[PDB]
Design a protein around this nucleic acid. Structure first.
Ligand SMILES: [Mg+2]
Ligand SMILES: [Mg+2]
Ligand SMILES: [Mg+2]
Ligand SMILES: [Mg+2]
Ligand SMILES: [Mg+2]
Ligand SMILES: [Mg+2]
Ligand SMILES: [Mg+2]
Ligand SMILES: [Mg+2]
Ligand SMILES: [Mg+2]
Ligand SMILES: [Mg+2]
Ligand SMILES: [Mg+2]
Lengths: 214, 25, 127, 97, 197, 63, 91
RNA sequence: GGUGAAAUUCUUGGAUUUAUUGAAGACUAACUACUGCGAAAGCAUUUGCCAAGGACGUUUUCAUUAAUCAAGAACGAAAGUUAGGGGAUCGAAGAUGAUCAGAUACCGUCGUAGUCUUAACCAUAAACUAUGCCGACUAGGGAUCGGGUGGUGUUUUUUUAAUGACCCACUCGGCACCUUACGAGAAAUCAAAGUCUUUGGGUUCUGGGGGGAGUAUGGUCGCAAGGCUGAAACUUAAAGGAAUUG
RNA sequence: AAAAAUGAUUAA
């Protein structure tokens, strides 16, 4: 007999305070014993949590958020930002025919060494009183738009470091700034970043995450 | 018989003819 | 106030997987498939087998602690059919029968931007 | 004789398009020629919508959908009754209904 | 003479006595007369410079690599050969490299190498075409040419000797534990025959 | 043996290769909102009670 | 006039050693006896002394190169890799 | 795992299924259309560099410099050949499990060559619109791409500005569609396959009943595979196209 | 998406 489910500890997860309610959920690993036990084997965890779960607003039901466990004290797993991406059903909802898709991408680092790749998506818009059925762009508007996206995203990163990058990523204010900067070139339907991925990270920096948590 | 297989059979047969003339020359 | 887990229903053809893990996913709770309870070798993907597997999932889920789940429905994906098998709906059906609470249902089919030429040949699977 | 003015496909002006694979048999068929259908289906069946609504933490849940572009070869589309061979005069009708 | 790769002759100042010291390096591709070579821990990442393996990034191409620090070069010495730096382990002061034979190796990070690839590559791409060119090749190396086949000898001379036809007559795969005079053929062969059919 | 009882409220159609099976829509007597479709062997009218060994499957061979 | 149809410099070998071997030797001898631009003085004056040694008849610069050509493709890739790595380390 | 169903296969040496990564190679979904570009073959991630091109606008310039073209040339899918690199996937050969009367087929699991690339070859496809190229005229519409013109037009900026994006009316060029043929056609059908016994705008190429046969031979090109050019003897009353009824 | 080969000559 082994019955492995009787030697687990039921730890708890805490989000970083650049969100609403810190309660995420529960985890469990193994009994702490000799020979390099689970004091560190519980470190490398990533939790997928809905942004509506983290903010209590139903209209954030997409944009699922990564949270990476970085340090553990007591019965508490402190997590930091690890990435973001849209939900697949939301993506397939935006991507429809008789319109042009613009997908831009940048790789930039914040004030600290948080190098990270920001994506972005947009779709051309059928304006009012449009008899025309498709409303495609001219591949030069597309290039101009993608240039503006890259400029804006690089402007928003490498200043306003990761903590307040998340704090302004939550209310969807960046894509509004795209809406202002690109409304003169070509109308658009759905501007989003659609994904943030962290590439590599600096030294552990215990103070940053003890600053976020508490 | 299918035309492309007739062509393949003829090509093999022409290979054989060229080899037999190679024996004599 | 309810403890959450992840369902991770992989409903291919030829089989269905109901594979509950924690909210993170390194460790698992009661991975049971349709093929370990039907001896047909061909009913392994049947909705009945999937519903039985989900019931065994919930049976071992209780007295382990999970009470609600987020749902990740998966097809074979990649170059293959990328459509859910017949047992996925039944497995989710039975997980919701057995008292386990449901939230955040999503599809996790691996969808490729073209890669890895599909099997079957140029003329396809000729039947 | 020639069956269709657009031979069996939609290609007048380029010459080569690209091949896509049939979902059923993985037969290589040009994309302009493939029978393409949009499968937009609720992720849960109608027999389960009421149950998941009763068994959800989140009241008035979004009830997500699934989207899929299906590519069929001519043979699989006919065998699956996707296209259903038509009469000579009705063959010209392009209307989806 | 007898070496495919050319040799660079490099002059350094003696740090402790007033004089010059000649060193015979194996020349890397691109190194030219009148070029300045920089050797040391703080030397720059340029072709011809001599650096510790811990002072170069992964993917660096080096040559004349020391197996141990201070042995003055043992790996990737023949023409057109090089070592690829593939990783670092600063915890144990070690570096992983790929050798010309495809073998993976762990070396002290204090072992030195020369940035670049040994000059003279492509030499073996030219057929010799005739016995005399092999003759002149080996008269500058050693007395190993020409080679008589064992099966062309008598049994007194070779395990393959003898018989009323030329044939080996017993398996030519010889074990590791065979003794001197027995190791003629394919020693400790894991397999034989043409690879991939 | 948790044998359940169901009341047929709608007859859907006739299935099977030889047409020997009937599809019915049945609610339960304890709960009148737990409707399932079932496959029945013999002749069936409306307002009949079936005894089910198993009470979770959905009948196939629709439409 | 055209003295040979295809053997070129390998006409010195007559009919022996086989056509394929002679063609293989032909490509490398043409490379090996060719004159090359001097990267230092800008003149078509670089010739091979011995395998791997390339000397300019003016400015007398000698550079280590390939056995039968001044620069091999692998060597050019190595130079590009070293430049990329050095610039990455500096940036 | 896989199939009608199974078995070849892996599995307590933890297989399948999770999660954290890493490596390699190939490809570029959705957007993607009776849309675009290119002489054709073909061309779909972003950005930079290089040269090229059509159309449009033009009250710029030369002034017949043109059309089509034996000979002669460049390019030319896939497969295939030589050598180096690469070699994830899929997979002529092969292996192997099924099915079968037999299955050295279809189906399943593996898998060498290939698939990718560089330097060279090859020069063929239902390389098709099975419709040579240039020019003129003849019919009734709605769309769409690119350019240009105009507005008792609108629109996010100034709540009344170039612009960009839509609307309306035109126009030139293009991919194409819908109706009907007045016309043509053996018909299928065709806005050209019309302006044809009321037969002549210019010009290139090809065919002359079915087979033998794209064979034989000669020449020429290719490393080869083979390509290009290309008969005759003999044989035979049909072969063939479109449509009708069953 | 189980298996399913064959049918002498003339005779409108
Ligand atoms: Mg069929
Ligand atoms: Mg027909
Ligand atoms: Mg083509
Ligand atoms: Mg010998
Ligand atoms: Mg003898
Ligand atoms: Mg012996
Ligand atoms: Mg386009
Ligand atoms: Mg065609
Ligand atoms: Mg033709
Ligand atoms: Mg066009
Ligand atoms: Mg004739």
């Amino acid at each position: 007999v082994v019955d492995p489910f009787t030697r687990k500890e039921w730890f708890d997860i805490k989000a970083p305070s650049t969100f609403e309610n810190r309660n995420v959920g529960k985890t469990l690993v193994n009994k702490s014993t000799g020979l390099k036990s689970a004091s560190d084997a519980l470190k490398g965890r990533v939790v997928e949590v809905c942004l509506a779960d983290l903010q209590g607003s139903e209209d954030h039901s997409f944009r699922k958020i990564k949270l990476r466990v970085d340090e553990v004290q007591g019965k508490n797993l402190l997590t930091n930002f690890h990435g973001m991406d849209f939900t697949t059903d939301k993506l397939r909802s935006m991507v429809r025919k008789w319109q042009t898709l613009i997908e831009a991408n940048v790789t930039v680092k914040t004030s600290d060494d948080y190098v990270l790749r920001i994506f972005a998506i947009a779709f051309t818009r059928k304006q009012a009183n449009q008899v025309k059925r498709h409303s495609y762009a001219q591949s030069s508007h597309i290039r101009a738009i993608r240039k503006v996206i890259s400029e804006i995203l690089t402007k928003e990163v490498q200043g306003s470091t990761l903590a307040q990058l998340t704090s302004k990523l939550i209310p969807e204010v960046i894509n509004k700034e795209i809406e202002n900067a690109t409304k003169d070139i070509f109308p658009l339907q759905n501007i989003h970043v659609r994904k943030v991925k962290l590439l590599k990270q600096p030294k552990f920096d215990v103070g940053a995450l003890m600053a976020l948590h508490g | 018989m299918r035309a492309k297989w007739r062509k393949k059979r003829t090509r093999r047969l022409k290979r054989k003819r060229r080899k037999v003339r190679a024996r004599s020359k | 106030s309810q403890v959450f887990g992840v369902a991770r229903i992989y409903a291919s053809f030829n089989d269905t997987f109901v594979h509950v893990t924690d909210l993170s996913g390194k460790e698992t709770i009661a991975r049971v498939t349709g093929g370990m309870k039907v001896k047909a070798d061909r009913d392994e993907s049947s909705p009945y087998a999937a519903m039985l597997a989900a019931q065994d999932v919930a049976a071992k889920c209780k007295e382990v602690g999970i009470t609600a789940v987020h749902v990740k429905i998966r097809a074979t994906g990649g170059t293959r059919t990328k459509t859910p098998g017949p047992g996925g709906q039944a497995a989710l059906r039975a997980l919701a029968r057995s008292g386990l609470r449901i939230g955040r249902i999503e599809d996790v089919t691996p969808v490729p931007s073209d890669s890895t030429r599909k099997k079957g040949g140029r003329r396809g699977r000729r039947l | 004789p020639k069956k269709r003015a657009s031979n069996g496909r939609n290609k007048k002006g380029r010459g080569h398009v690209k091949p896509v694979r049939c979902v059923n048999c993985s037969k290589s068929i040009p994309k302009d020629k493939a029978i393409k259908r949009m499968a937009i289906r609720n992720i849960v069946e109608a027999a389960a919508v009421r149950d998941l609504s009763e068994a959800s933490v989140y009241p008035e849940y979004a009830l997500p959908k699934t989207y899929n572009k299906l590519h069929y070869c001519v043979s699989c589309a006919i065998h699956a009754r996707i296209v259903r061979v038509r009469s000579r005069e009705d063959r010209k009708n392009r209307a989806p209904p | 003479s007898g070496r495919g790769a050319p040799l660079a002759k490099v002059v350094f100042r003696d740090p402790y006595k007033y004089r010059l010291r000649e060193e015979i390096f194996i020349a890397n591709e691109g190194v030219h007369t009148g070029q300045f070579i920089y050797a040391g821990k703080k030397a720059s990442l340029n072709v011809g410079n001599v650096l510790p393996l811990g002072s170069v990034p992964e993917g660096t191409i080096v040559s004349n690599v020391e197996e141990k620090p201070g042995d003055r070069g043992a790996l990737a010495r023949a023409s057109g050969n090089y070592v690829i730096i593939i990783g670092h382990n600063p915890d144990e002061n070690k570096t992983r490299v790929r050798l010309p034979s495809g073998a993976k190796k762990v070396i002290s990070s204090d072992a030195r190498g020369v940035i670049g690839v040994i000059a003279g590559g492509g030499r073996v791409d030219k057929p010799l075409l005739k016995a005399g060119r092999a003759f002149h090749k080996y008269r500058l190396k050693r007395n190993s040419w020409p080679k008589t086949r064992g099966v062309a000898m008598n049994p007194v001379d070779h395990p393959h000797g003898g018989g009323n036809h030329q044939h080996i007559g017993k398996a030519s795969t010889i074990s590791r534990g065979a003794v001197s005079g027995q190791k003629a053929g394919l020693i400790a062969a894991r397999r034989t025959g043409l690879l991939r059919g | 043996t948790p044998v359940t009882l169901a009341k047929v409220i709608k007859v859907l159609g006739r299935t099977g290769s030889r047409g020997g099976v009937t599809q019915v829509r049945v609610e339960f007597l304890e709960d009148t909102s737990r409707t399932i479709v079932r496959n029945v062997k013999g002749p069936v009218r409306e307002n009949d009670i079936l005894v089910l060994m198993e009470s979770e499957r959905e009948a196939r061979r629709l439409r | 006039a055209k003295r040979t149809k295809k053997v070129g410099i390998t006409g010195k070998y007559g009919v022996r050693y086989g056509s394929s071997l002679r063609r293989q030797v032909k490509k490398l001898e043409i490379q090996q006896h060719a004159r090359y631009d001097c990267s230092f003085c800008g003149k078509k004056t670089v010739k091979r002394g011995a395998a791997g040694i390339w000397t300019c008849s003016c400015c007398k610069k000698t550079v280590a190169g390939g056995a039968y050509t001044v620069s091999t493709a692998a060597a050019a890739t190595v130079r590009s890799t070293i430049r990329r790595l050095r610039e990455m380390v500096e940036a």
